[PDB]
From a paper:
Fosfomycin-resistance proteins (FosAs) are dimeric metal-dependent glutathione transferases that conjugate the antibiotic fosfomycin (Fos) to the tripeptide glutathione (γ-Glu-Cys-Gly, GSH), rendering it inactive. FosA enzymes are manganese (Mn+2)- and potassium (K+)-dependent glutathione transferases that conjugate GSH to carbon 1 (C1) of Fos, leading to the opening of the epoxide ring of Fos. The catalytically active form of the FosA enzyme is a homodimer, whose tertiary structure complies with the fold of members of the VOC superfamily of enzymes. Members of the VOC family share a common fold composed of two βαβββ units that form an incompletely closed β-sheet barrel.
Numbering used by the authors:
A (entry chain B), B (entry chain A): 1 to 139
Write the structure that this text describes.
Amino acid sequence: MLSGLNHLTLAVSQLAPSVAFYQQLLGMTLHARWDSGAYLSCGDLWLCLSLDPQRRVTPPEESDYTHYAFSISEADFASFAARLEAAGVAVWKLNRSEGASHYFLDPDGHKLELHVGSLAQRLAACREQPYKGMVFFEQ
Amino acid sequence: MLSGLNHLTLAVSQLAPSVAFYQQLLGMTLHARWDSGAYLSCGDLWLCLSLDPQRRVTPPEESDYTHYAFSISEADFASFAARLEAAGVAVWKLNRSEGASHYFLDPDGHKLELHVGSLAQRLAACREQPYKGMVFFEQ
Ligand SMILES: C[C@@H]1O[C@@H]1P(=O)(O)O
Ligand SMILES: [K+]
Ligand SMILES: [K+]
Ligand SMILES: [Mn+2]
Ligand SMILES: [Mn+2]
Ligand code: NA
Ligand code: NA
Ligand code: NA
Ligand code: NA
Ligand code: NA
Ligand code: NA
Ligand code: NA
Ligand code: NA
Ligand code: NA
Ligand code: NA
């Protein structure tokens, strides 16, 4: 039986710039680095950066909606997003769903998000205003 | 400051087959589905499947190393992987690192993994046998 997310691994085209992005701009903890990768952590999240010379720098209009959202408190959200903006980090979408979200890109075009709010909060908002054709499942 | 992964969103080409994969073959909890998505949970992990016309069914040799790993116990690992293989779920990589891992594909070719072990256990094993060029960082 599966108990949660064990780790997220992102293919990166240049290791040093990607480590700098996740460690310095996003504040994650760098634990180890080798010739072809790095290990970082973000709370309980284990992030592996894997050097892959065939990772394409991908424009967001050419990639699908697959994306990775990190948790942040409502008190920290606005200034964190403002620093990413000041650092020239590109935004790939405007927030259109409940709970503050900032949708931004990593150096290789991986689609990322800062989000304030839980699954329980999202389901509660959906129960008041269901999405199109939505069906609810219980205990 | 980021506190962990908030949610993982996967673009899918056919919603019902993808829900069946994550709910029935991987055992995750289905909370809600709608015309263009579904919300599931796996322990603390909030998984969103997003119906996206841009998603193509992608052979593993046409995608990079980016992949998503779920936690499983030592005791459950072998039979869980065997059930996936018996369900026709393809394997995309042989395990070559510390701790049991099974590398498998979802219906659209998203690269997935079952893994037994934590970041702390990986770091300890890496100190004993360092990867090429591996360096570690204190605290
Ligand atoms: C929560 C799932 O990623 C979608 P959203 O970011 O559009 O809300
Ligand atoms: K949102
Ligand atoms: K492994
Ligand atoms: Mn999202
Ligand atoms: Mn992995
Ligand atoms: Na971790
Ligand atoms: Na993608
Ligand atoms: Na950018
Ligand atoms: Na960048
Ligand atoms: Na989390
Ligand atoms: Na589960
Ligand atoms: Na959408
Ligand atoms: Na690869
Ligand atoms: Na993939
Ligand atoms: Na993917």
